[PDB]
Design a protein around this ligand. Sequence first.
Ligand SMILES: CCOc1ccc2nc(S(N)(=O)=O)sc2c1
Ligand SMILES: [Zn+2]
Length: 259
Amino acid sequence: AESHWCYEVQAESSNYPCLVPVKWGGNCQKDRQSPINIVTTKAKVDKKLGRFFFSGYDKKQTWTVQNNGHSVMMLLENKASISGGGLPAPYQAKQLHLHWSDLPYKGSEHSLDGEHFAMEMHIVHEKEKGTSDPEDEIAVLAFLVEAGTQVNEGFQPLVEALSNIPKPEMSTTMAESSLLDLLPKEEKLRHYFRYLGSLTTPTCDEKVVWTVFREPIQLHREQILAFSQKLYYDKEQTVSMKDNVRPLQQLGQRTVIKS
Ligand SMILES: CCOc1ccc2nc(S(N)(=O)=O)sc2c1
Ligand SMILES: [Zn+2]
């Protein structure tokens, strides 16, 4: 650890040295890493991957949201959970965050058939374990975001909050909203891809069971641009927050499955 981990854009936009992704420490150099490209036609249908059950997702809350220096993060604090989805237990929701760029064809961490989307949103959950860490301790639900002309009203509380947290270490409270406000219609979340991998920022622990839903969130171009326009990586506000994206990792001998 010769310097703090960063994304490539930060290294390229500032003279202050930092460890770019290919140099990350932790478990970040192991072989069951994320994100990946998904060849959709090569992922086999597994019949055990049934629908999700979301709890606390429809409930209107006033969430705390913060700039942690690499993303914007909603604190979910077990106020929501999931089950089904071929998952082996209920998982409690801890936090939601995003990765993005400022061009529509990049911004997502995962790619589907070699296409990146404009953002990727991650909802991070923790396994409810029995008595005797595992490869599926954490369940991250990934939603791809497609750029368009449709104003997503569901996202407005979040997007408005961004102006209040431009620098790292800053928190604000969002206007009343639910998690379902931010997602596609529930009936469109029956199609998803599933594989085992890692966390995409250090320490990149190989303990994530990934879900990438097929159906994108639609967000207006300028609601997407609001992220890079209002947020910074640093207190000095020299680097606008964008391209907070880990490059693609090799699948190796892992298999990807779908519903
Ligand atoms: C302090 C909590 O620790 C971490 C560390 C890395 C990390 N990556 C993700 S992501 N990008 O969803 O795969 S959630 C997460 C949480
Ligand atoms: Zn993430």
